[PDB]
Amino acid sequence: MRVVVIGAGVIGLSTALCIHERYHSVLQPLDIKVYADRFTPLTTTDVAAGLWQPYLSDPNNPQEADWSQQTFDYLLSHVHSPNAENLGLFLISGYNLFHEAIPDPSWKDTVLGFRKLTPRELDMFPDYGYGWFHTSLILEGKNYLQWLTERLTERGVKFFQRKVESFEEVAREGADVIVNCTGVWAGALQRDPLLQPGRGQIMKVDAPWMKHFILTHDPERGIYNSPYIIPGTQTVTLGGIFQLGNWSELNNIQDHNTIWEGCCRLEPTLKNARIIGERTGFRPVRPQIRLEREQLRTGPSNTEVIHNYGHGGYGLTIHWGCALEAAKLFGRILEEKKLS
Amino acid sequence: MRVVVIGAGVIGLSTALCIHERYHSVLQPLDIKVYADRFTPLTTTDVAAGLWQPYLSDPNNPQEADWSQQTFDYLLSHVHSPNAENLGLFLISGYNLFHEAIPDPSWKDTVLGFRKLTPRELDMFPDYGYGWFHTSLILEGKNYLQWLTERLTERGVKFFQRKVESFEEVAREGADVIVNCTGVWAGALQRDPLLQPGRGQIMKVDAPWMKHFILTHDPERGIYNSPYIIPGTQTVTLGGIFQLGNWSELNNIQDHNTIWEGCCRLEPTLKNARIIGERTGFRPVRPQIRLEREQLRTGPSNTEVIHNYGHGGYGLTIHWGCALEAAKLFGRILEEKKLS
Ligand SMILES: Cc1cc2nc3c(=O)[nH]c(=O)nc-3n(C[C@H](O)[C@H](O)[C@H](O)COP(=O)(O)OP(=O)(O)OC[C@H]3O[C@@H](n4cnc5c(N)ncnc54)[C@H](O)[C@@H]3O)c2cc1C
Ligand SMILES: Cc1cc2nc3c(=O)[nH]c(=O)nc-3n(C[C@H](O)[C@H](O)[C@H](O)COP(=O)(O)OP(=O)(O)OC[C@H]3O[C@@H](n4cnc5c(N)ncnc54)[C@H](O)[C@@H]3O)c2cc1C
Ligand SMILES: O=c1oc2ccccc2cc1O
Ligand SMILES: O=c1oc2ccccc2cc1O
């Protein structure tokens, strides 16, 4: 009963934890190994601010909306425990600003105190005439990854630093079930023409007087290509870069200047904030998450593959409803094989 | 035309600035001196978190409500300037939690996005069943005092470190108008049986993941004797001590334990927050602010006194409507004396 999880981002770690907590007793010799090229300080998950916010549109897969809601409910129930800070979990309120009166989100009742912005609030942001105010949650990738790692270490999950070349290489080592949580790099193991990098560039700035997130929206320039300010525990994340199909894992001045100019206009107090760091990340963009079973009859033995990737810019927002669904798929592998 | 302001807290400094900005041209040789025992890092103003919040009750003096509103409007208009951080000025949202359904405040429309808490929000705080959520402003005393000082230094206002024994001592030095902004210590210069210390004890804790203020209310134990959490730029203020008539300028373990136990129950994540400092302050409590003219015919020459003290736990919330009213009273001294 050997299980290999490929990837140590929020997807891989949360899935490994979910499978363990649901099947560690059910199956007595349950072996779980985590195979990843990049761990905990250097994944895409570490680059994310961690704000819980799904896309404004209804998902292509109606299950995704339920997956997001399940994660918010799981996270909100732990927000007040004396542990919540080890997870990098905290409540935060803020603004979603629009150029016109768009419909309310599907998640309007999932979040706390959702409402329409008043004219006195809209007066504070001179280029926007519509908006929302609500209270959401930030789950910082860096801390959450460290937390999931500790939980996995105490549960006997063994971690391995390696770049996997094919699923066959893994199957040959004697892994019955393979959990593929490769993120943006999932194409390298099995070509997927629906998966593409959603290049983002962000600035981490010291502005501790910023207590609210501010996300702006423009249908013209599209999703995440508009300014955003997301306060974290130690720093403030400045962003607004979204370049589909760009694999440049390097910061660039044009993107820097665009984030700076755009964020300073939104919040002019930022002109005196110190820049601590700047980073680049690839959102694993797909029309919908690939979370399904596949048979590797093309390779060694029977050997089933659980795909779990393509979380775009909403990986942290959705991860828990995903890990649970993957844990449900893992159970179906046990019952179908006549292994009750 | 010599003017002496006694006090370098928010009251004295904001009044000195207001008189200067309104009468520096009107009167060509306008001499302004600031006399204070304790300056900028050590006043009661430095101990205040700086949240804009008047009392839940309608003021005894209906002008006080207009004075608070004038300060919020003045501060909100400067919240977004690239300077706002030199002032220690920032927007903040949060909770006011009650044991029962009390009426809406007088200031419900002064604040941003004021609303009643929903049942899902009230579920987060197990001992409270009613509440409000709104967006207010924090004006940090420490930074604001440094700002007013710089503004006064560039305007030629001369500062003097001394303990004034009587108004007569000041009148004898040749001061025509005396502005008395002595705060809680105003009784020492002229007995005032309405003015009393509102002893408060606070903890400054490192909890940067706290993005909202939380103020609790109990009619049983009274005003500010209930837990409160107020995040600042660099630290989180923990409080809930209000002892009328207690002059103990010393922290005590009973008050410490009361703030700790009460705040940790409100927000259990605080159990792992580091204590950076603890302080004691005396709110200058009076049934209403004394902001009026008095003739010192009892002392040297004619010599008018402008009283400006007794701002309780709402000094920063009200200071600007006060400084403006004092500046208006100073003008009445010029026109009555047949000095047009
Ligand atoms: C700038 C930016 C901001 C974002 N902000 C938010 C946000 O506020 N909220 C939110 O909900 N989401 C956000 N996201 C999205 C979030 O970061 C992702 O959806 C989530 O981190 C992706 O998780 P993952 O586990 O799919 O990928 P990753 O974090 O990339 O991890 C994939 C893992 O698989 C590994 N791997 C890949 N190929 C192999 C191989 N052959 N062998 C071994 N290992 C392999 C990598 O080494 C890595 O460990 C943001 C993204 C970016 C870039
Ligand atoms: C624990 C606590 C928390 C608070 N939180 C808030 C809040 O969140 N929001 C809010 O709006 N308000 C708050 N307050 C209230 C606020 O601190 C006061 O109302 C305001 O600071 C008082 O201002 P002042 O200028 O009257 O007094 P002070 O800051 O005390 O200054 C009085 C000045 O007069 C001087 N002085 C006195 N006597 C003499 C003399 N004989 N000669 C020379 N100088 C003299 C002192 O040296 C000092 O410089 C809080 C108070 C406390 C104690
Ligand atoms: O760049 C991003 O910013 C966000 C802000 C809030 C919620 C999700 C995201 C995803 C992004 O890619
Ligand atoms: O202790 C105090 O806490 C406050 C919180 C908000 C607004 C005013 C006050 C005044 C206090 O004295």
GROMACS .gro file of C-alpha atoms and ligand atoms in nm, chain A residues 6-12 35-39 43-53 145 162-165 181-186 188-189 198-202 228 230 241 280-284 308-318, ligand 1:
model
  113
    6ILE     CA    1   0.463   1.456  -0.630
    7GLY     CA    2   0.478   1.818  -0.509
    8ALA     CA    3   0.527   2.006  -0.182
    9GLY     CA    4   0.313   2.313  -0.247
   10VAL     CA    5  -0.025   2.369  -0.080
   11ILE     CA    6  -0.179   2.103  -0.314
   12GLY     CA    7   0.058   1.818  -0.247
   35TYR     CA    8   0.858   1.380  -0.382
   36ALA     CA    9   0.930   1.746  -0.469
   37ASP     CA   10   1.194   1.949  -0.654
   38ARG     CA   11   1.123   2.267  -0.453
   39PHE     CA   12   1.003   2.266  -0.093
   43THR     CA   13   0.731   2.704  -0.418
   44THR     CA   14   0.457   2.910  -0.600
   45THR     CA   15   0.262   2.874  -0.267
   46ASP     CA   16   0.528   3.087  -0.088
   47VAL     CA   17   0.475   3.374  -0.342
   48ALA     CA   18   0.095   3.391  -0.278
   49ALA     CA   19  -0.041   3.651  -0.035
   50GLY     CA   20  -0.301   3.390   0.069
   51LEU     CA   21  -0.623   3.590   0.054
   52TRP     CA   22  -0.935   3.378   0.034
   53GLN     CA   23  -1.100   3.499  -0.286
  145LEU     CA   24   0.351   2.497   0.436
  162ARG     CA   25   1.404   1.511  -0.636
  163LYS     CA   26   1.289   1.610  -0.983
  164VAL     CA   27   1.061   1.330  -1.116
  165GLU     CA   28   1.108   1.284  -1.501
  181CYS     CA   29   0.030   1.789  -0.740
  182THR     CA   30   0.295   1.939  -0.975
  183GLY     CA   31   0.122   2.273  -1.023
  184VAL     CA   32   0.233   2.477  -1.325
  185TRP     CA   33   0.499   2.214  -1.416
  186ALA     CA   34   0.244   1.931  -1.457
  188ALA     CA   35   0.644   1.811  -1.817
  189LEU     CA   36   0.513   1.470  -1.687
  198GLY     CA   37  -0.009   3.285  -1.513
  199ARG     CA   38   0.300   3.497  -1.453
  200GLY     CA   39   0.275   3.730  -1.160
  201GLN     CA   40   0.526   3.978  -1.015
  202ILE     CA   41   0.477   4.117  -0.658
  228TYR     CA   42  -0.389   4.510  -0.556
  230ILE     CA   43  -0.270   4.271   0.038
  241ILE     CA   44   0.069   4.154  -1.297
  280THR     CA   45   0.786   3.623  -0.951
  281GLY     CA   46   0.546   3.326  -0.955
  282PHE     CA   47   0.354   3.117  -1.206
  283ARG     CA   48  -0.015   3.069  -1.129
  284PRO     CA   49  -0.104   2.715  -1.258
  308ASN     CA   50  -0.461   1.742  -0.858
  309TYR     CA   51  -0.338   2.061  -1.034
  310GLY     CA   52  -0.445   2.376  -1.218
  311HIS     CA   53  -0.560   2.598  -0.927
  312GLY     CA   54  -0.485   2.929  -1.105
  313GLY     CA   55  -0.475   3.224  -0.862
  314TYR     CA   56  -0.701   3.048  -0.613
  315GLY     CA   57  -0.493   2.753  -0.484
  316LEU     CA   58  -0.501   2.854  -0.114
  317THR     CA   59  -0.872   2.961  -0.144
  318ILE     CA   60  -0.972   2.612  -0.273
  681LIG     C1   61   0.194   3.631  -0.770
  681LIG     C2   62   0.087   3.526  -0.714
  681LIG     C3   63  -0.005   3.555  -0.616
  681LIG     C4   64  -0.105   3.460  -0.568
  681LIG     N1   65  -0.200   3.492  -0.467
  681LIG     C5   66  -0.297   3.401  -0.422
  681LIG     C6   67  -0.393   3.428  -0.326
  681LIG     O1   68  -0.395   3.550  -0.267
  681LIG     N2   69  -0.487   3.337  -0.285
  681LIG     C7   70  -0.491   3.220  -0.339
  681LIG     O2   71  -0.590   3.148  -0.294
  681LIG     N3   72  -0.401   3.171  -0.434
  681LIG     C8   73  -0.301   3.258  -0.481
  681LIG     N4   74  -0.207   3.230  -0.574
  681LIG     C9   75  -0.215   3.097  -0.632
  681LIG    C10   76  -0.146   2.997  -0.549
  681LIG     O3   77  -0.012   3.044  -0.533
  681LIG    C11   78  -0.146   2.868  -0.630
  681LIG     O4   79  -0.272   2.835  -0.694
  681LIG    C12   80  -0.100   2.746  -0.540
  681LIG     O5   81   0.017   2.787  -0.466
  681LIG    C13   82  -0.044   2.645  -0.639
  681LIG     O6   83  -0.021   2.530  -0.562
  681LIG     P1   84   0.036   2.391  -0.612
  681LIG     O7   85   0.058   2.322  -0.499
  681LIG     O8   86  -0.047   2.372  -0.737
  681LIG     O9   87   0.178   2.450  -0.676
  681LIG     P2   88   0.321   2.489  -0.617
  681LIG    O10   89   0.330   2.583  -0.502
  681LIG    O11   90   0.394   2.541  -0.735
  681LIG    O12   91   0.395   2.351  -0.595
  681LIG    C14   92   0.402   2.256  -0.704
  681LIG    C15   93   0.500   2.163  -0.638
  681LIG    O13   94   0.520   2.061  -0.731
  681LIG    C16   95   0.662   2.051  -0.754
  681LIG     N5   96   0.692   1.988  -0.876
  681LIG    C17   97   0.651   2.029  -0.993
  681LIG     N6   98   0.700   1.941  -1.088
  681LIG    C18   99   0.772   1.840  -1.022
  681LIG    C19  100   0.844   1.723  -1.055
  681LIG     N7  101   0.862   1.675  -1.180
  681LIG     N8  102   0.903   1.649  -0.948
  681LIG    C20  103   0.896   1.685  -0.819
  681LIG     N9  104   0.826   1.797  -0.798
  681LIG    C21  105   0.765   1.876  -0.889
  681LIG    C22  106   0.727   2.185  -0.729
  681LIG    O14  107   0.860   2.155  -0.698
  681LIG    C23  108   0.646   2.220  -0.612
  681LIG    O15  109   0.686   2.163  -0.495
  681LIG    C24  110  -0.105   3.330  -0.619
  681LIG    C25  111  -0.001   3.303  -0.720
  681LIG    C26  112   0.091   3.394  -0.764
  681LIG    C27  113   0.198   3.360  -0.861
   0.00000   0.00000   0.00000
